[PDB]
Design a protein around this nucleic acid. Sequence first.
DNA 1: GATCTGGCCTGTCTTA
Lengths: 77, 342, 342, 310
Amino acid sequence: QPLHALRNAEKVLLPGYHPFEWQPPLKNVSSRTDVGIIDGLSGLASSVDEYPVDTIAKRFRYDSALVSALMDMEEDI
Amino acid sequence: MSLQMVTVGHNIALIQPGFSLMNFDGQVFFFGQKGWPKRSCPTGVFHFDIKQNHLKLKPAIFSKDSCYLPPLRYPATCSYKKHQYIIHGGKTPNNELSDKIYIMSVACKNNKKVTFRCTEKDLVGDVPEPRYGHSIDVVYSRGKSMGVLFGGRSYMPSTQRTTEKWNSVADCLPHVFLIDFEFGCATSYILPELQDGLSFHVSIARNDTVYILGGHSLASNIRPANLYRIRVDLPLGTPAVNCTVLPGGISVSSAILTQTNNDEFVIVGGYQLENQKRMVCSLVSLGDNTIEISEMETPDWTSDIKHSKIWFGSNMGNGTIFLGIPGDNKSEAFYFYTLRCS
Amino acid sequence: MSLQMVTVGHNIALIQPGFSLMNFDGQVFFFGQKGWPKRSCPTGVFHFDIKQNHLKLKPAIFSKDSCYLPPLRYPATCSYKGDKHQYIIHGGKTPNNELSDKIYIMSVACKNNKKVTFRCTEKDLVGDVPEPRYGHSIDVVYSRGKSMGVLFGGRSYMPSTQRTTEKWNSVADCLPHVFLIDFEFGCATSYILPELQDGLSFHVSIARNDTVYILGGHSLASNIRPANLYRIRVDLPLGTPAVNCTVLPGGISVSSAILTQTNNDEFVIVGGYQLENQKRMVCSLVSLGDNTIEISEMETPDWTSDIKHSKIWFGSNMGNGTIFLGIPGDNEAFYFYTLRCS
Amino acid sequence: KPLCLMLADESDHETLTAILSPLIAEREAMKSSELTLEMGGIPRTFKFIFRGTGYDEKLVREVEGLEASGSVYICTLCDTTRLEASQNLVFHSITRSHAENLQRYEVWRSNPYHESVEELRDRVKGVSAKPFIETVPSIDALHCDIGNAAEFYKIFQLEIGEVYKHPNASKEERKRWQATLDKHLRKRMNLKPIMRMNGNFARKLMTQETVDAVCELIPSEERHEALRELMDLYLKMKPVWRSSCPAKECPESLCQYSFNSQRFAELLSTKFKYRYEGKITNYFHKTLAHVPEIIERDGSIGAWASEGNQ
DNA sequence: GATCTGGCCTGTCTTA
Ligand SMILES: [Zn+2]
């Protein structure tokens, strides 16, 4: 298959594609279930007045990552 | 007016942006290091002294009744009069804003060996939320003292704080808080002359008036040139606080206040715009009720500052002003200067 | 028999297996370094000096009419005093892996303030010239008030016909012919002896008035280290010379041995290589008479644990009954030890 | 499976906490909930029990609020000192929890009894930082093996030179001893000299043959027996903490681990006084004191190793 | 005015 077909099929495996909900709502955690690669700094202030920032980071959301991991192991279970 | 190079000893890495130098009887003491205190100094309070343009950080211990206060990166230091200082707010090494309030002092001194007495104070009432980058002053009205806290930034409320924006900050309410150091009580005053959350400002204290200078507002991303007056009164009933806006302000944030002579201060350092840095100085003269902000001759800045993007310092106290700039990393991560005004 | 550690200066990298120490009136001199000479010492001869168990190699100079010979890794050294004391160099292996065939003669031309000045003159042969080779040995012979050199066979590359690029570094032993070289004129002549049956290399030859004692060696033709010693007795009448060889009982099977003289008409030999992976560790003593020989086993030296397990080891003769040997290390590349046996 | 990638110094505490705060927040949030989702057309229910064990000792000291490894409170599982850990070697139960560390740091910060530096440090058992990550008091088998191999290697070096006979030694003697050992190992066990202790080098170094090759350098005869029994006990104790299921792959080694550990400690205390008198490392203590309890608690050491991240 | 103390260094040990 050409590259666009592969890229399109990739979206099924990445986190933020399957619906779910926690029965007790998670405190201080959003309920939206389509986030992908959240920024690592998490909205950290990067102006000139605050503490200087000299790092970069990328990461998924924890619950979405667990959901994707569990869905990747459906046939096994 | 005169700039000078100063070399630092082996523990240069313990200096980070946001430290707080404190002066006790012509002796400047370091505070607010990087990371948690190690076995080299379990307390984290150093002896900031300079001999022949050379810096050597010496450790210090506490008394048998102190409280091992954690390092803070943006507290609100304030003198008080025996002689003692007050610390409130700031960012712990775990990125946690402290709500407590601290009181440093000297317990025993001999042969240049100072033993501190850190006492924690319990604040009750209209207590301020944990903040950082604010300011606090002490006013004297009818033989009484009172703390004047204002400004500062903090995280989102516990309900509106999400992990996707866990590090987002916002300016606090423009309320004015009076703190009684004896009873340990606070009181919230809202004033109609304050509508914008202010942070990283400059505060000048007098007998009964405090003067707010410059700062930054996250709600607008603007550097307003303001000049406020807050004349706190201490009658036999309830303290009445008033405000007044004054013309002729300065547009700067994160400046450094000092005191050359009595009833006159000097402003240096700061930031005019985001990418622009304030290179000129400013003289502040005071009287009984009048104020005057003038201009002086700019110091002879070197090629290092004129092209640097960030700098951080603090008032040494005896007319001099400590200053530091970043550098290469591998190497020396920071260069450090001193600036005298007398 | 007393081992001793010997430290080294900065230029340790200039020593390699196969060097040659030459002695001129108490002073031992170095020769045969690694690579072509640099600007530190263009000549390549170094003052081998040991003091307080410490080696200090320093440069040396030549006269205004010498010949800058290349450093050789397996020459044939021998003393010659017949006047001015002088050494003889034949064969060798240039740093370009090319075998030399020219004869060089070392000699002291001048000296002052313990600074010698050499005189290296070139010498060429005529008649039956030997194939350029290494690992052989040359000695001098006196007979009826007349000197003569004896050159036994060694090993070399393939001849110019069968030498192919797929075996460009193959080595075969030269034919066992005896060469008599007249140093005064330069005429060499090849003789044939029925007793000499196979080629021999890295052997040890003992010289005397008019007879050379070839003891031990290594034969590449059959990969065997024989245990037979030879006795080449020659004579120099007014006519053509005559050579004879007779095998003798009581030989020794050693290759790459280091020989040195202890007393008048008495020699001591140290171990070499006994088998491929087996190493000769016990020493032997050679006592001469007038027409007889005698070999015995002395007390084994107090060898160290590093030598007892090292696979490769090399050295040469200093001259005062002292042996300078080295041990390879790792990655300080060699560990050099000295040995005195009176 | 990856979860976060950043470009920051591990020793940099402020940036590390600032980046890892949301992850720990979400973890602590969902550690008290249950997840439902429809796989195969049927909704299910899930509950999580998270265990942080893939941390080396340095990062454990950093996040749990302890100090560097060179201190006297060496164990992160018990609160013993260096002298007691060198005088006992056996009896040490685990009492070190996240809530306990939080309480310790609170006592340190508040100082309710009005004590000096040393007394308050003894009271808190060396806690001068606020924990932010909850970890499981376990052992990292990879770094344990590496440290034990390094320690043994050092012991080999000291045995070649007969330190028990000459307590003093220069630096060139040490250099020579190390070079001779390296040369021997290269010529016999086919091992190149390395700067820092490896993992495969550690695996290949811990054999009976290795002791056989090393004994060719020690002229003594009792030392030989000592090293043989030392290596024998260590090889008898290795599979207990290295197997993925000791209860079903090596029950004899599991049942006899206590006896073997006691004999190992007695051997070190008797015939190895020249090095292990009044001092001990971290991993020797961890192996001789805390392995059976972790086994009976979790069931398997090694399956929770930090090797996968490497 | 020699006498212990203070503090500063420094090599070793411990984890990476
Ligand atoms: Zn322990």
